[PDB]
């Protein structure tokens, strides 16, 4: 059964750091899934302190058994269920058993370890991609969202953000030929064009990220001394040689769409929207 | 069910290799031969259609039928809903979706210019209509890419393939 | 590939419809019975040109059954795939045995044995896809594939595509 | 596949398996597979063949007790017999003690079998001693062992 589960898994033996990360992710996944069970256990058995800490220890031990020692679920349940239950004594010193887990939870452990083994390759791929980028200054958003990255959706968001804000660098690293059209070629042209300073002058990217992460105003968005149309037309007239746009309205639309793409590829907005939808969203048909 | 204008084709003894369908070899079978006959029996050429021409024709015919059914008084969904038959409605919906999501030329004049270029050209006077439709449809960018996708054009080296491709890319709306 | 063809249909009419509106009724019957059908010999008939001005001629009374038989000739737009042709597509489903794409009304199935090896199927991805380092093909993704074989059914056509050669795969 | 190979190897070796240890000695399997499948496969013990003490067919092989806990089961059996002459390393004496406990040569005068006396043993003390000596949480294991001695393969 384990061989069948691991047939698709090319790389299974993780490192100790990866092993601990897998244990932490599995514990967090169970806590999210079994939140009702943990809450009921804590409320009913409020006298015992850190029951959930012993639960985390038992989950870590079960993951250790399954991964390192390759123990099937019935063997663990028939010969290692002492770890799965915590025997506490009440005020009367009566031995009370607390069934922390069941066999279905062990199957959930197996499924979750397979899931994390799958996502480990993706997180390693993102780490390798970032290392190949070799940024002169480590991007604070990258670190902040990579440290808290748990789902593959967040890893995909990281990939999209990195590719968008380093489209030229990513394309060069790919070059470092099938004429696939880069969807970011227009944005690269905007970066190369003289209108990119106007896009900067709309709002500072680092200041925007700091304000969004703080959720409150740390800096005030300074309005440029001239209107967007004024600056666009002035730069177009003074740089007719380099301004690839035909009309000022076309440049205005390109700037607006570039700003929209910048806002869309921000990981924090996506994460907040996803959390809001997962928490308070409704279903309509 | 429907019968082609080509009939007869009785028993013989010889067997030929130009009977099997093959796009690369330009063997389209008897019913899709280069020479056809109309209702009057006169000579007729095989009529291929690029996605632009096909989209133009289907939109024109569908809107004409919709106008006629309403006593001669634009939306693709409504236009598909005009037709009768749930399966027919689904089929026309799928064809319209394909044509819209891969329409290289959504303008009548652009398609007219493309057809004029691909027909009146001296090099294209020998090009097979299937080759012309493939060129106008796949939207290839390179001579090597076009030759790989269309093996027939490899043997036709008397074609200004690269400049024609650039002309098509220019005519293609960015 | 789309074409213009001159097709003919045999239409039988019951005597209960022998009225002044016979011709128009024959026209709508032809439209309902031809639009959207799938014949293996021709492919798929998508539309009939000049659908309201089709000549029907004079119907012949079948001896011994009363019903009239009409020979209707018309011009219609027909689409038919050919062996060894490269066309655009949109992926409709992803599965471990392969992925299913749609080329107009035709649904094309591509097996893993006709897919490049680097495009390993990822079931953990949302949605599951056949992805490589620089390529990711999932539901709704544009793909350029070459039709290798076509299977003829009663009123259906089954085609098999491949992306294992150059200038294929994701687009 | 593994079950087919195992049954084919058993058939080639002979008509039946002698004891659980032979699954390892006869090269019938690997180590982790044996450890996983050890307690879930059994051989029916028979007091008729028990006559020779040298019997390779261990009685504990017909119980849910894991082979890794056969020594612990022997120690518990010695604890119930209250015989302090036997030390903790005389495994032949432990085997004879189990022989007497489960299949005594002389039937007990009362209706309480020697396996019943295991109820007088305090499992909590033994569990605490084991956890102090070797850091093992085995109180549930001791309970299971006591249950198996009280009835071999009670239906679940």
């Amino acid at each position: 059964r384990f061989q069948a589960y691991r047939k698709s898994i090319k790389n299974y033996k993780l490192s100790d750091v990866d092993y601990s990360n897998e244990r932490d992710w599995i514990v967090e996944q169970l806590k999210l899934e079994k939140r009702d069970f943990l809450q009921h256990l804590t409320q009913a058995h409020s006298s015992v302190a850190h029951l959930e800490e012993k639960f985390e220890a038992s989950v870590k031990k079960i993951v250790d058994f399954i991964a390192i020692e390759s123990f099937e679920v019935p063997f663990i349940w028939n010969h290692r269920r002492d770890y799965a239950l915590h025997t506490y004594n009440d005020d009367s010193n009566n031995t009370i058993i607390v069934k922390l887990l069941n066999e279905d939870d062990l199957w959930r452990i197996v499924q979750l370890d397979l899931d994390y083994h799958s996502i480990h390759d993706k997180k390693a791929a993102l780490s390798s991609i970032y290392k190949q980028l070799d940024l002169d200054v480590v991007d604070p958003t990258y670190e902040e969202f990579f440290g808290s990255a748990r789902t593959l959706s967040e890893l995909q968001d990281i990939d999209d953000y990195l590719t968008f804000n380093y489209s030229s660098q990513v394309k060069n690293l790919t070059a470092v030929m099938k004429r696939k059209y880069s969807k970011y070629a227009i944005y690269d042209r905007i970066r190369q064009d003289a209108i990119y300073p106007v896009v900067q002058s709309i709002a500072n990217i680092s200041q925007m990220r700091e304000n969004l992460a703080q959720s409150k105003r740390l800096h005030q968005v300074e309005d440029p001394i001239e209107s967007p149309m004024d600056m666009i037309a002035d730069i177009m007239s003074t740089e007719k040689d380099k301004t690839t746009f035909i009309s000022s309205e076309k440049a205005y639309q390109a700037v607006k769409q570039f700003f929209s793409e910048q806002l869309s590829y921000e990981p924090f907005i996506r994460k907040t929207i996803r959390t809001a939808f997962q928490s308070f969203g409704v279903i309509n048909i | 069910v429907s019968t082609s204008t080509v009939g007869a084709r009785r028993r013989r003894a010889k067997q030929q290799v130009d009977d099997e369908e093959n796009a690369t070899l330009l063997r389209l079978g008897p019913e899709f031969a280069l020479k056809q006959y109309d209702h009057d029996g006169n000579e007729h050429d095989l009529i291929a259609l690029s996605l632009s021409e096909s989209r133009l024709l289907i939109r024109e015919a569908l809107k004409a039928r919709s106008r006629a059914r309403n006593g001669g008084v634009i939306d693709d969904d409504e236009l598909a809903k005009v037709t009768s038959g749930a399966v027919a409605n689904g089929v026309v919906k799928k064809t319209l979706d394909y044509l819209n999501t891969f329409a290289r030329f959504k303008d009548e004049e652009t398609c007219t210019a493309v057809d004029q270029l691909l027909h009146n050209s001296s090099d294209c006077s020998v090009l097979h209509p299937f080759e012309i439709a493939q060129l106008s449809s796949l939207g290839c960018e390179d001579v090597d890419e076009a030759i790989t996708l269309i093996p027939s054009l490899a043997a036709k080296k008397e074609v200004n393939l690269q400049r024609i491709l650039d002309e098509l890319n220019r005519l293609e709306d960015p | 590939m789309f074409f213009l063809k001159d097709l003919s249909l045999i239409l039988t009419l019951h005597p209960s419809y022998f009225g002044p509106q016979m011709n128009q009724y024959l026209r709508e019957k032809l439209l309902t019975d031809v639009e959207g059908t799938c014949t293996g010999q021709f492919g798929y008939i998508v539309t009939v040109l000049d659908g309201m001005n089709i000549d029907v001629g004079k119907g012949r009374i079948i001896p011994g059954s009363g019903s009239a038989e009409f020979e209707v000739k018309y011009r219609a737009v027909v689409w038919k795939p050919f062996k060894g042709e490269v066309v655009d597509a949109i992926v409709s489903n992803v599965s471990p045995i392969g992925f299913f794409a749609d080329v107009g009304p035709l649904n094309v199935f591509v097996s893993t044995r006709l897919i490049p090896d680097n495009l390993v199927y990822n079931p953990s991805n949302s949605p599951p896809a056949y992805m490589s380092n620089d390529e990711l093909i999932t539901k709704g993704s544009k793909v350029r594939l070459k039709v290798v074989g076509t299977r003829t059914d009663v009123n259906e056509i089954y085609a098999i595509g491949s992306i294992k050669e150059d200038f294929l795969g994701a687009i | 596949r593994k079950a087919a190979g195992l049954i084919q190897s058993i058939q080639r070796i002979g008509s039946n398996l002698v004891n659980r240890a032979h699954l390892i000695t006869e090269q019938l399997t690997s180590k982790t597979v044996f450890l996983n499948m050890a307690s879930f496969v059994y051989i029916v013990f028979d007091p008729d063949v028990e006559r020779n003490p040298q019997g390779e067919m261990d009685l504990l092989d017909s119980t849910r007790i894991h082979p890794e806990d056969y020594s612990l089961a022997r120690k518990m059996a010695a604890d119930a017999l209250d015989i302090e002459d036997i030390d903790d390393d005389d495994e032949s004496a432990m085997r004879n003690a189990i022989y007497e406990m489960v299949f005594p040569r002389s039937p007990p005068k009362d209706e309480d079998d020697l396996t019943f006396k295991l109820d007088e043993l305090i499992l909590d003390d033994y569990a605490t001693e084991l956890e102090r000596k070797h850091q093992l949480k085995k109180r549930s294991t001791l309970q299971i062992i006591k249950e198996e001695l009280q009835s071999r393969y009670r239906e679940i």
Side-chain angles (χ1 to χ4, degrees):
Chain A
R1 274 173 284 288
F2 272 45
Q3 297 176 41
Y5 289 138
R6 289 194 279 264
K7 172 156 185 184
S8 73
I9 309 300
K10 301 172 182 185
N11 171 24
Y12 181 60
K13 181 140 73 74
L14 301 170
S15 81
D16 299 334
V17 169
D18 293 311
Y19 201 84
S20 164
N21 296 323
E22 172 161 281
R23 297 163 96 204
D24 306 328
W25 186 82
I26 279 176
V27 166
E28 288 172 353
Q29 272 291 321
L30 288 179
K31 266 198 199 189
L32 186 48
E33 160 61 26
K34 288 196 90 194
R35 191 201 47 73
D36 286 335
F37 168 77
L38 292 171
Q39 215 158 8
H40 293 329
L41 165 63
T42 291
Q43 284 160 203
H45 313 75
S46 57
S47 65
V48 177
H50 307 90
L51 268 175
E52 57 276 15
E53 270 77 1
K54 290 301 200 177
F55 165 83
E56 298 154 68
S58 291
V59 167
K60 283 194 174 185
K61 201 71 175 177
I62 291 303
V63 173
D64 294 340
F65 283 128
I66 279 174
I68 299 157
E69 313 179 1
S70 74
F71 278 165
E72 187 67 26
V73 170
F75 169 80
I76 293 149
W77 185 259
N78 276 294
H79 307 297
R80 301 287 195 283
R81 56 180 312 147
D82 307 62
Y83 301 81
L85 59 86
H86 166 87
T87 58
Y88 89 90
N89 304 324
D90 51 355
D91 52 357
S92 306
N93 207 64
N94 315 329
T95 314
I96 295 168
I97 64 176
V98 177
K99 295 192 272 305
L100 273 180
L101 285 185
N102 56 37
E103 190 151 11
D104 199 78
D105 303 322
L106 279 73
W107 299 113
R108 197 42 177 153
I109 287 291
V110 179
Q111 300 167 353
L112 283 168
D113 84 14
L114 285 181
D115 286 331
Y116 190 91
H117 277 283
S118 176
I119 75 163
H120 164 273
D121 296 333
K122 172 167 194 178
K123 80 179 296 183
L126 276 296
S127 185
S128 164
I129 287 308
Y130 175 76
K131 277 189 178 67
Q132 270 163 239
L133 269 295
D134 188 19
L135 304 183
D136 309 327
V137 164
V138 168
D139 186 74
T141 302
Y142 168 83
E143 270 308 286
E144 281 188 358
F145 281 88
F146 188 88
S148 77
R150 52 170 57 256
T151 80
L152 60 86
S153 171
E154 295 178 356
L155 300 184
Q156 187 49 78
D157 286 316
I158 285 300
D159 166 68
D160 284 332
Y161 162 83
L162 291 186
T163 58
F164 170 73
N165 294 113
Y166 310 99
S167 48
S168 70
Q169 299 83 324
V170 166
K171 173 161 209 155
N172 299 319
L173 278 149
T174 299
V176 173
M177 186 269 286
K178 316 203 169 40
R179 299 299 167 165
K180 58 98 178 180
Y181 169 62
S182 180
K183 276 73 69 178
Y184 300 100
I186 287 160
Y187 310 123
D188 298 330
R189 190 181 314 164
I190 294 151
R191 294 163 149 281
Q192 299 140 32
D193 193 78
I195 207 68
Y196 182 72
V198 176
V199 185
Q200 303 157 33
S201 79
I202 299 172
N204 176 283
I205 302 161
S206 293
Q207 289 193 348
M208 283 193 288
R209 292 181 295 155
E210 286 167 279
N211 282 341
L212 188 59
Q214 187 64 36
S215 313
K216 283 195 175 184
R217 283 288 195 77
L218 292 175
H219 326 292
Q220 179 184 77
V221 181
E222 207 280 330
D223 287 301
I225 297 169
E226 300 200 38
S227 77
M229 184 51 72
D230 274 313
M231 287 306 306
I232 279 162
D234 292 339
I235 284 160
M236 172 174 252
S237 64
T238 57
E239 296 292 331
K240 300 161 162 229
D241 315 328
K242 314 200 164 180
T243 49
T244 56
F245 312 101
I246 293 168
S247 78
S248 77
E249 202 51 82
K250 281 181 181 177
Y252 181 98
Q253 292 316 118
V255 174
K256 204 151 46 168
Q257 74 176 0
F258 192 89
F259 201 86
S260 164
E261 289 282 72
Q262 284 176 303
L263 270 178
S264 160
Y265 278 97
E266 167 52 53
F268 198 94
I269 302 174
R270 285 163 144 204
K271 200 254 207 177
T272 309
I273 294 179
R274 220 178 284 98
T275 291
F277 279 168
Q278 200 270 336
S279 304
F280 298 147
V282 304
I283 303 299
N284 295 325
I285 181 166
Chain B
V1 187
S2 191
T3 317
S4 81
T5 181
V6 174
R9 187 70 272 171
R10 276 177 195 187
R11 179 67 180 271
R12 283 179 191 169
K14 267 194 175 185
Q15 311 309 314
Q16 62 276 7
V17 75
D18 303 351
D19 180 272
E20 294 85 340
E21 199 72 21
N22 200 321
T24 74
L25 313 179
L26 288 186
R27 307 173 190 188
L28 295 173
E31 71 275 25
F32 279 101
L34 189 62
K35 313 305 293 187
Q36 312 280 262
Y37 293 128
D38 54 357
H39 306 133
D40 317 321
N42 301 122
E43 204 195 38
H44 183 59
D45 287 327
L46 165 64
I47 302 305
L49 285 181
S50 66
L51 278 71
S52 81
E53 296 163 345
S54 315
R55 206 174 165 282
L56 286 196
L57 261 181
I58 187 169
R59 269 193 59 88
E60 177 72 20
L62 275 183
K63 71 177 51 181
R65 187 182 313 174
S66 187
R67 179 169 53 248
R69 82 164 178 75
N70 277 320
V73 291
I74 46 167
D75 189 31
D76 293 338
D77 284 336
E78 157 198 344
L79 199 55
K81 285 181 291 184
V82 168
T83 62
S84 182
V87 59
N89 284 311
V91 164
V92 304
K93 271 184 175 183
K94 289 191 184 70
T95 58
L96 273 188
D97 298 327
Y98 184 95
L99 287 182
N100 190 359
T101 61
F102 293 92
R104 199 169 178 207
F105 314 102
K106 299 190 180 176
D107 305 336
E108 182 179 354
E109 302 187 1
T110 66
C111 195
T112 311
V114 164
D115 185 24
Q116 289 174 18
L117 161 66
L118 293 170
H119 279 204
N120 311 122
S121 293
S122 65
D123 294 1
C124 301
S125 57
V126 186
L127 281 186
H128 207 268
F130 182 81
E131 304 167 321
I132 302 158
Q134 278 303 325
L135 284 167
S136 177
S137 303
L138 288 189
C140 317
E141 310 171 354
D142 304 330
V143 167
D144 292 329
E145 169 186 31
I147 286 169
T148 300
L149 297 182
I150 312 168
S152 68
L153 301 183
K156 301 200 179 189
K157 299 188 177 181
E158 308 162 349
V159 177
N160 286 127
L161 185 48
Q162 187 61 58
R163 62 176 291 276
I164 284 158
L165 284 165
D166 308 347
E167 292 186 39
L168 274 172
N169 301 342
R170 156 198 158 177
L171 285 159
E172 185 165 26
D173 290 322
Chain C
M1 177 45 63
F2 297 90
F3 292 91
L4 279 193
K5 277 285 286 191
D6 299 347
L7 305 190
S8 77
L9 192 53
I10 283 285
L11 270 179
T12 292
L13 187 64
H14 192 270
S16 48
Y17 298 107
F18 286 171
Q21 318 93 337
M22 180 165 55
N23 289 320
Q24 73 182 10
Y25 174 82
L26 272 173
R27 290 173 218 274
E28 288 98 11
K29 188 197 271 273
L30 160 72
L31 286 180
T32 54
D33 295 11
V34 165
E35 294 282 328
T37 197
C38 165
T39 68
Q41 208 276 349
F42 286 114
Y44 286 72
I45 297 97
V46 286
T47 49
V48 169
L49 315 181
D50 198 24
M52 310 317 293
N53 303 319
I54 311 160
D55 188 13
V56 299
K58 300 189 194 189
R60 185 177 61 84
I61 299 300
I62 302 298
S65 70
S67 293
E69 182 179 1
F70 285 80
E71 165 82 23
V72 192
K73 290 180 217 156
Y74 65 103
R75 308 171 40 79
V77 183
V78 58
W79 187 84
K80 182 168 93 170
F82 309 130
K83 167 154 57 182
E85 188 39 60
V86 184
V87 292
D88 293 331
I90 287 171
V91 170
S92 56
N93 182 23
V94 190
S95 64
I97 60 164
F99 68 102
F100 303 85
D102 298 337
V103 188
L106 167 61
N107 182 255
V108 187
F109 161 59
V110 184
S111 167
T112 52
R113 310 177 179 203
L114 300 181
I115 302 171
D117 302 330
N118 46 320
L119 279 165
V120 183
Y121 166 54
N122 186 357
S124 296
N125 201 335
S126 286
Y130 281 67
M131 64 191 305
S132 82
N133 305 344
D134 310 316
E135 316 182 358
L136 161 78
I137 288 173
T138 188
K139 184 160 188 175
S141 310
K142 299 185 185 175
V143 298
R144 171 165 291 166
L145 55 91
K146 174 184 184 185
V147 169
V148 179
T150 64
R151 173 172 58 200
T152 291
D153 206 325
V154 183
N155 275 340
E156 276 199 339
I157 299 164
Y158 296 90
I160 288 178
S162 176
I163 46 168
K164 189 179 289 294
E165 308 157 16
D166 302 332
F167 311 96
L168 305 185
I171 46 170
Chain D
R1 302 171 198 83
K2 186 60 63 69
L6 189 144
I7 200 167
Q8 288 179 10
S9 306
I10 295 286
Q11 176 70 10
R12 277 192 171 143
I13 279 177
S15 61
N16 80 284
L17 180 73
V18 175
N19 60 349
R20 282 172 157 159
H22 278 173
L23 291 178
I24 283 295
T25 76
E26 309 298 324
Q27 277 299 110
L28 290 158
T29 185
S30 50
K31 162 163 181 190
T32 56
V33 175
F34 171 82
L35 281 177
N36 287 297
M37 77 166 293
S39 50
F40 305 96
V41 63
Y42 71 101
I43 293 154
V44 170
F45 191 85
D46 179 26
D48 185 18
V49 190
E50 185 183 1
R51 267 56 145 160
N52 51 344
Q54 277 191 359
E56 308 161 37
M57 301 71 66
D58 194 352
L59 173 56
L60 308 178
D61 287 348
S62 82
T63 56
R64 274 178 170 82
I65 303 155
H66 209 274
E68 75 187 4
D69 298 342
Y70 284 176
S71 63
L72 176 52
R74 276 149 198 157
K75 170 167 161 60
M76 181 182 287
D79 293 333
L81 292 186
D82 294 331
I83 306 169
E84 308 179 54
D85 296 332
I86 303 163
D87 306 333
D88 276 295
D89 298 330
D90 198 349
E91 76 277 13
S92 189
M94 310 306 257
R95 200 184 64 209
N96 284 330
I98 287 179
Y99 287 167
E100 188 63 31
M101 170 169 290
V102 177
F103 304 104
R105 189 53 260 185
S106 287
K109 294 147 185 174
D110 45 358
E111 307 204 280
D112 270 328
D113 197 36
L114 310 188
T115 61
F116 177 78
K117 299 180 132 202
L118 290 151
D119 304 317
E120 315 168 320
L121 310 183
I122 309 185
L123 311 184
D124 289 331
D125 292 344
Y126 296 166
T128 308
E129 289 314 277
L130 281 180
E131 193 164 358
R132 189 195 35 77
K133 291 154 166 195
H134 311 94
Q135 317 202 345
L136 303 173
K137 292 166 172 191
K138 288 277 195 73
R139 62 175 325 282
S140 179
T141 313
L142 300 150
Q143 181 52 258
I144 279 158
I145 290 156
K146 161 164 79 178
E147 293 179 353
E148 271 306 294
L149 276 296
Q150 287 145 338
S151 282
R152 297 190 288 154
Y153 278 160
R154 187 264 314 284
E155 175 53 86
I156 311 295

